[PDB]
Design a protein around this ligand. Structure first.
Ligand SMILES: CCCCCCCC/C=C/CCCCCCCC(=O)O[C@@H](COC(=O)CCCCCCCCCCCCCCC)COP(=O)([O-])OCC[N+](C)(C)C
Ligand SMILES: CCCCCCCC/C=C/CCCCCCCC(=O)O[C@@H](COC(=O)CCCCCCCCCCCCCCC)COP(=O)([O-])OCC[N+](C)(C)C
Ligand SMILES: CCCCCCCC/C=C/CCCCCCCC(=O)O[C@@H](COC(=O)CCCCCCCCCCCCCCC)COP(=O)([O-])OCC[N+](C)(C)C
Ligand SMILES: CCCCCCCC/C=C/CCCCCCCC(=O)O[C@@H](COC(=O)CCCCCCCCCCCCCCC)COP(=O)([O-])OCC[N+](C)(C)C
Ligand SMILES: CCCCCCCC/C=C/CCCCCCCC(=O)O[C@@H](COC(=O)CCCCCCCCCCCCCCC)COP(=O)([O-])OCC[N+](C)(C)C
Ligand SMILES: CCCCCCCC/C=C/CCCCCCCC(=O)O[C@@H](COC(=O)CCCCCCCCCCCCCCC)COP(=O)([O-])OCC[N+](C)(C)C
Ligand SMILES: CCCCCCCC/C=C\CCCCCCCC(=O)O[C@@H](COC(=O)CCCCCCCCCCCCCCC)COP(=O)([O-])OCC[N+](C)(C)C
Ligand SMILES: CCCCCCCC/C=C\CCCCCCCC(=O)O[C@@H](COC(=O)CCCCCCCCCCCCCCC)COP(=O)([O-])OCC[N+](C)(C)C
Ligand SMILES: CCCCCCCC/C=C\CCCCCCCC(=O)O[C@@H](COC(=O)CCCCCCCCCCCCCCC)COP(=O)([O-])OCC[N+](C)(C)C
Ligand SMILES: CCCCCCCC/C=C\CCCCCCCC(=O)O[C@@H](COC(=O)CCCCCCCCCCCCCCC)COP(=O)([O-])OCC[N+](C)(C)C
Ligand SMILES: CCCCC/C=C\C/C=C\C/C=C/C/C=C\CCCC(=O)O
Ligand SMILES: CCCCC/C=C\C/C=C\C/C=C/C/C=C\CCCC(=O)O
Ligand SMILES: NCCOB(c1ccccc1)c1ccccc1
Ligand SMILES: NCCOB(c1ccccc1)c1ccccc1
Ligand SMILES: NCCOB(c1ccccc1)c1ccccc1
Ligand SMILES: NCCOB(c1ccccc1)c1ccccc1
Ligand code: NA
Lengths: 636, 636
């Protein structure tokens, strides 16, 4: 990144004020005392009306706003605490201690950063305790391009508050010192709208390491708060800390929140998992479904399934209510809607076939009327439905067209070519055969959409798409190099044939020469040596050189590259069809009306505590492997 | 799973009795004393004839049968023992202690569960000792759908007795407390017929982990019993704990039982392995063959070989008498019966060939009579023998048709088509050639059955079957998509040819078009551009698009998927032919008569102890690697 002005500067890029910053940096105590006396006497020699203002302009930098207190804290030495006790005592007789401890940068990239923001970051618990006990602001919002970047490489976002700075830098002794302070606003929201619990989700990691202080900071702040105000708070985008963990793909944080159970009464009401009974490996629990089920707009189940930015959707959709809601919707409507979508579309491809095969060749019942009117209606049903999904779609397709958004185009292109064949055939035109045949060939080719979501057949549609997009299209630029180079080369040697006998040279034009050289590449060629040219040996040299390069080397090079794609999909094949069915379920739920979706709703009302009635889900879990390993070491 | 009623419930799904259950749960001692006095005085205000009955209806739940003693034990707190001592003393002055400690659930899914079943499961050795010393039933059978499920995901099966509950949950201090109790029936059988040693086999694991308490519970209960009553006990299916370990595939338990040797006299008679002498790496032992050799009906060797449900047959057939009986039967009859089965069937395929090749073309010795009568008899011998094996076979073929039950059909189908060709040729019909040729081609194709069971040739028959069933048939649904789509597409562009010259377009029909498109896929095709249509460029576009998809992409995609199958069989190839020969031996033993099987019987009578004469087998084992590692650390 770049900021065009440093935070601290001690190297110059090629007199009372400049010596004070050169005294608080190295740690010269006896020099700093002699310099402050020279500035204490320099207040009254010309005026006594402006004492509190003139004392501040000689201790602050006029370009950044950095004070002499900030300069001592940016440069940590073992003589640091002695400098702070002198500078805070110097503002006592001048009565300027109120504005000296609450100063901030006036520069646009570090605006709002105070001396308390530096002392907590340098791990100075004794110095930060002296500032708060003197009048430092515990609610100072450090804005700016450095503290509020646009990406995670152009600064450092922690939450803009001193409570979020100690929480993100693993310092719980300062968090306990700030939460006991009665002027600290815990539920404060920064420029992003994030509170103390949104900012911990942002700095969290995606997987489980050895030390997880973010989960420890999440539990410590939430239980000492003792309310739901930090959890129901939404951002400027309208996201809770539960929904933010699903958006950014933090599976360890999303697992902890969504099965949080507190056994202690006076603290039990802050739970989302409620175990009813347990007997060995069998447990019965109640799970909160407040923002999880798809009854609100931006629900957690809708985020995780449609989150193409992240890599761990299979880890997050295995979690504790998310796998059961996804399974119960399949056994109620989504298996029925997938079977009928197969049946109405397989009947649609047969009717396209039997009107394309039995077309009126030269001369130009109730079941025949039932067939052709079904073609005109079902093609308009797809072109409206798939046309909305393309319009409601963003142009950054590198992550959505993996297996998902590729089918939204080919069902739409096939539906338009059926409709375009109607306008051509009826009016006056003969180009209907060019549109009806290509729609029928693409119509049968779209039957591989119904192989998706199954353990045995789900990986075949991914193998076809990933070979085309990642192996074949990047290999056309290697092969057209040799197809167009040798194509003009062999066509230039062919002499103009004497008048008759058009089968005297197959390479007699550039359009001819590309055809046979494509046949030598795939192996349907002919090494003809008749070939009436003035250079028979030179034609025979470049013809065999083409066969060795394309057929022997470049053809088997592509097969070795396509074979690496097939084995990579086959290793991930158990994770593919589980993510294919998960998107198929939620698209079928959006096709349902409101009166029918209300019958399909899961959940029952519970009595958690006094004035607490939330929507639950009873999930009977049995864990044999986790039980046998648990019992074994209690009696080793 | 689902049970529609919980064991314990503390969350309500949206007055003297209800306060007692709300007193024993949290642990309020001073509240519970005040509530019992209010119920002690509420016995005599309206009648004194029904004291023992009315005292029980106010302390038990009328819907499940759960008492107040069970409610305190389901909710473990540090104030648990104080509640139990009050409730057991409360039943003393009322003289209702006999029916208060022996109560059970009246609900159909938890019937028979008592307070002793809960106290042992919650690890309360002090509370369970107070119940047994007061009159609790140590032989209470906890039946129900939860405690007796149908699968291992719909409950928790442990053995239905309190002795089996402490044994399966790794609690030997309660097992020693129950086996010293003189009213405890150790040889009790539950609803499955399982005893204390069958139930440990059911909860056992298939492989060797770090901690194996199941083997420790098996040894501790059996040696303190001191008899063979627990070992000879059979289930409702007729299974000993030795035969149950072979049925469920527990190799660690089946290894421990089948080489159990106790060196201590007064305890030596409970052994199955008897070491005769040992000198360094060479040892001579005698192994018990009571239910192991194939002289009883449901023997251990017959179970393990024919156990297609399990994955570790190679680990279990390597064990200590099972590998020697399998090897001694091969060197006595099974190598001779496999060689003659090769010779009588190779002579059968030659005679089918020489009557199919030298058939009467147009006009319609003793060795010729010997040949054709051998065909009529040997085809009836296979059709009777293989017809019984199909009839005695279950329709769940996903695990038996791997390499084993596939040959029972193709020897039968080949034998019927020989017999069907006799009825067609003799009577009046000319369809004998359609049955004799397909039987002769399948007859030579069944010669790969005799490649089975050999280290160099055994894996080839598995590679052919696994490629067809797991790669090819799941790829037809990918390819008929492109074969039927482009087949009608290219046939619809072909104009009806002017009258003569049938070789004007090869795609002139749908039956024609499938033939050449199959030839372009395998690589025997032709990119003809003559092709008299009204769309020569549009025909040429879809023809090359078919070649790039099928021949270049989809053909090499299948080869990459078939190549993963070949390398997976080649890695498991040493485990395949050892399991192929093991099934070949036991099928040849069933073909033997009783007088000839008695000559082939292994074993000699031994004198183990007084009144103990069992059938042995002397196996001279030498273990060089296990000896050199053993001696090395005794003198490090
Ligand atoms: C303009 C356009 C408008 C469109 C109108 C639509 C909009 C309005 C719609 C309204 C519909 C209303 C909702 C549906 C409610 C029905 C309830 C139901 O029975 O569902 C059931 C399915 O029932 C079945 O019969 C499934 C049959 C087997 C499917 C096999 C999948 C393969 C499909 C072809 C793939 C071939 C692959 C080969 C290669 C390609 C749910 O499943 P289940 O059976 O209950 O689960 C068993 C569990 N249980 C029984 C224990 C509970
Ligand atoms: C997944 C998809 C896979 C498949 C998709 C692949 C699809 C490829 C399909 C290919 C089919 C090609 C058909 C050709 C049609 C005619 C062309 C023509 O007119 O040429 C003429 C000139 O011929 C020349 O001299 C060629 C010069 C072209 C300059 C190339 C620059 C751009 C190439 C950038 C590449 C370098 C980039 C480098 C980066 C590494 C010859 O004309 P004619 O034949 O004699 O006509 C007879 C005239 N008459 C009719 C009146 C008698
Ligand atoms: C209606 C239908 C009725 C059916 C009637 C039947 C029912 C009644 C039946 C009654 C039969 C009675 C039982 C048999 C007793 C014989 C004893 C015997 O000698 O056995 C021996 C076999 O000796 C041999 O002769 C084996 C010859 C080599 C075989 C090689 C295997 C390859 C076979 C072709 C594969 C080609 C693969 C190529 C690719 C395809 C046992 O072996 P061994 O030699 O002893 O072992 C050496 C150990 N020792 C010598 C140290 C001890
Ligand atoms: C291990 C095993 C591997 C090998 C086994 C593979 C074996 C495959 C073998 C294949 C050989 C095929 C031979 C065809 C025989 C004739 C058929 C016919 O009559 O067609 C007629 C209509 O033609 C059409 O219009 C086709 C329409 C059929 C509808 C398809 C629906 C079901 C497909 C479900 C698939 C989608 C499922 C989607 C799931 C993803 C054309 O007839 P004709 O030709 O003009 O006849 C001339 C008439 N005359 C004689 C009087 C002159
Ligand atoms: C999946 C992997 C893809 C890539 C790998 C590829 C390999 C695997 C792919 C396998 C796919 C199989 C494609 C076969 C092509 C059929 C051609 C055809 O139509 O026959 C003929 C039709 O003849 C008939 O009318 C009667 C039908 C006989 C067809 C028997 C073919 C074999 C069937 C299954 C064999 C099972 C073997 C199982 C072995 C394990 C041709 O028609 P015609 O006679 O010329 O026209 C007559 C004119 N008329 C119109 C007047 C009538
Ligand atoms: C990269 C991997 C390499 C190794 C693997 C190989 C596989 C991958 C390789 C792919 C490379 C593709 C090479 C195709 C060769 C074309 C031949 C040709 O020129 O056509 C014809 C020209 O016809 C015309 O005049 C109009 C052009 C139509 C050409 C359409 C061909 C398919 C286009 C793309 C299909 C997209 C399918 C996408 C499927 C995913 C032949 O000419 P002619 O008619 O005989 O001459 C007439 C005489 N005249 C001169 C007077 C005019
Ligand atoms: C998986 C769930 C399935 C969902 C529903 C699927 C069910 C779909 C079932 C039927 C759909 C058809 C209804 C459309 C009505 C119009 C038909 C038409 O065009 O006329 C044709 C009549 O039909 C024939 O005679 C064609 C015979 C070959 C058909 C091959 C059988 C496979 C397709 C069907 C079986 C598929 C079974 C699938 C499995 C059940 C024209 O033929 P013609 O006599 O020559 O007329 C002379 C015209 N000419 C003068 C120009 C020459
Ligand atoms: C890949 C794209 C570029 C292709 C290579 C370009 C690079 C070339 C660079 C330099 C070559 C410079 C010399 C060639 C010029 C004269 C040739 C000549 O006149 O023909 C002669 C012989 O025809 C031949 O067979 C000559 C051999 C071809 C030369 C290739 C060099 C070897 C490189 C090998 C590496 C493999 C290739 C690369 C693979 C990694 C004449 O014979 P004629 O025809 O019967 O005519 C008789 C009439 N006359 C005698 C009066 C004439
Ligand atoms: C591994 C253990 C081996 C087990 C036993 C195997 C031993 C098998 C041994 C013999 C089997 C034969 C017994 C059946 C008797 C009937 C034959 C018949 O149909 O008549 C044929 C006579 O025979 C010939 O003339 C055919 C000559 C070619 C045979 C090729 C040798 C390979 C098979 C043999 C050697 C395999 C050796 C295998 C290794 C020992 C008809 O021929 P024809 O003269 O043209 O008659 C005119 C008819 N016409 C007028 C219609 C044209
Ligand atoms: C896979 C199954 C589906 C196959 C594709 C279906 C999707 C298509 C979707 C949309 C296509 C919409 C436009 C086509 C309709 C008009 C075409 C036409 O009239 O022919 C013209 C040229 O013939 C051609 O060569 C045109 C090229 C074919 C179009 C394919 C789009 C490119 C996709 C590439 C991707 C590779 C394919 C997919 C591989 C991943 C006319 O030429 P003529 O014949 O000589 O007749 C002359 C007389 N006339 C001028 C008066 C007419
Ligand atoms: C507006 C039209 C623009 C031109 C058309 C471009 C692209 C659409 C046409 C074809 C794309 C798909 C072809 C199907 C072939 C192989 C994929 C099999 C299905 C799968 O993936 O399993
Ligand atoms: C009642 C008849 C029904 C139709 C017949 C269906 C199936 C039997 C026919 C053929 C099956 C086997 C064919 C042999 C081809 C390859 C396998 C090689 C032998 C092996 O596996 O090593
Ligand atoms: N069969 C259990 C596999 O889990 B499923 C699953 C697991 C992870 C991610 C997505 C789905 C599942 C499959 C179908 C319907 C509902 C859930
Ligand atoms: N909207 C018109 C067709 O939509 B359906 C549809 C079409 C293609 C792919 C997926 C869905 C459909 C959905 C449920 C039942 C039947 C058809
Ligand atoms: N050659 C020793 C291999 O062990 B054999 C074997 C090992 C494990 C499982 C099954 C068999 C064996 C092979 C043939 C006959 C008897 C035993
Ligand atoms: N039962 C009629 C043929 O059976 B035998 C058989 C046939 C096919 C496969 C396996 C065995 C047979 C067995 C031993 C010796 C000779 C033949
Ligand atoms: Na390879």
């Amino acid at each position: 990144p770049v900021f065009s002005k440093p935070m601290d500067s001690n190297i110059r890029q090629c007199r009372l004020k400049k010596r004070i910053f050169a005294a608080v940096s190295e740690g010269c105590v006896e020099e700093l005392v002699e310099l402050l006396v020279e500035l204490q006497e320099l207040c009254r020699r010309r005026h006594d009306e402006d004492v509190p203002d003139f004392l501040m302009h000689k201790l602050t930098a006029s370009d950044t706003g950095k004070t002499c207190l900030m300069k001592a804290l940016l440069n940590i030495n073992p003589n640091t605490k002695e400098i702070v006790r002198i500078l805070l005592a110097f503002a006592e007789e001048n009565d300027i201690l109120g504005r000296f401890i609450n100063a901030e940068y006036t520069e646009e990239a570090y605006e709002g950063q105070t001396a308390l923001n530096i002392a907590i970051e340098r791990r100075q618990g004794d110095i930060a305790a002296l500032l708060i006990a003197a009048g430092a602001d515990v609610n100072a919002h450090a804005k700016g391009a450095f503290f509020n970047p646009k990406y995670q490489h152009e600064g450092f976002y922690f939450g803009e508050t001193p409570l979020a700075l100690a929480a993100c830098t693993n310092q719980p002794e300062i968090v306990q010192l700030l939460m006991e302070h009665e002027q600290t606003d815990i539920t404060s929201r920064d420029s992003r709208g994030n509170n103390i619990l949104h900012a911990l989700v942002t700095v969290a990691e995606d997987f489980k390491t050895q030390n997880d202080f973010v989960k420890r900071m999440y539990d410590m702040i939430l239980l000492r708060s003792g309310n739901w105000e930090l959890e129901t708070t939404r951002n400027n985008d309208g996201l809770t800390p539960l929904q933010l963990a699903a958006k950014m793909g933090k599976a360890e944080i999303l697992k902890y929140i969504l099965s949080r159970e507190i056994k202690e009464k006076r603290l039990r009401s802050l739970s989302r998992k409620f175990t009813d009974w347990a007997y060995g490996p069998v447990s019965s629990s109640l799970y909160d479904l407040t923002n999880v089920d798809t009854t609100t707009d931006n629900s957690v189940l809708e985020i995780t399934v449609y989150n193409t930015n992240i890599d761990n959707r299979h880890e997050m959709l295995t979690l504790e209510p998310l796998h059961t809601l996804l399974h119960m919707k399949w056994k109620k409507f989504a298996k029925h809607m997938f079977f009928l979508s197969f049946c109405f579309y397989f009947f649609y491809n047969i009717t396209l076939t039997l009107v394309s095969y039995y077309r009126p060749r030269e001369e130009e019942g109730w079941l025949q009327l039932l067939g052709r009117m079904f073609v005109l209606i079902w093609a308009m049903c797809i072109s409206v439905k798939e046309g909305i999904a393309i319009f409601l779609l963003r142009p950054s397709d590198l992550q959505s067209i993996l297996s998902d958004a590729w089918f939204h185009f080919v069902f739409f292109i096939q539906a338009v070519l059926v409709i375009l064949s109607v306008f051509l055939y009826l009016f006056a035109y003969k180009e209907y055969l060019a549109c009806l045949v290509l729609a029928m060939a693409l119509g049968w080719a779209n039957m591989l959409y119904y192989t998706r979501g199954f353990q045995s057949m789900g990986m075949y549609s991914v193998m076809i798409q990933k070979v085309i997009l990642h192996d074949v299209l990047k290999f056309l630029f290697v092969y057209i190099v040799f197809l167009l180079g040798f194509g003009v080369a062999l066509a230039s040697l062919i002499e103009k044939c004497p008048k008759d006998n058009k089968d005297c040279s197959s390479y007699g034009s550039f359009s001819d020469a590309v055809l046979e050289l494509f046949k030598l590449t795939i192996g349907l060629g002919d090494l003809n040596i008749q070939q009436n040219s003035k250079y028979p040996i030179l034609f025979l040299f470049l013809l065999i050189t083409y066969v060795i390069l394309t057929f022997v080397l470049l053809l088997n090079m592509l097969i070795a590259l396509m074979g690496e794609t097939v084995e990579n999909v086959s290793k991930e094949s158990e994770r593919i069809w589980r993510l294919q069915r998960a998107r198929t379920i939620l698209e079928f739920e959006k096709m349902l009306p409101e009166w029918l979706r209300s019958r399909f709703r899961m959940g029952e009302l519970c009595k958690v505590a006094e004035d607490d009635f939330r929507l639950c889900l009873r999930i009977n879990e049995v864990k044999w492997t986790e039980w046998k390993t648990h019992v074994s070491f209690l009696n080793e």
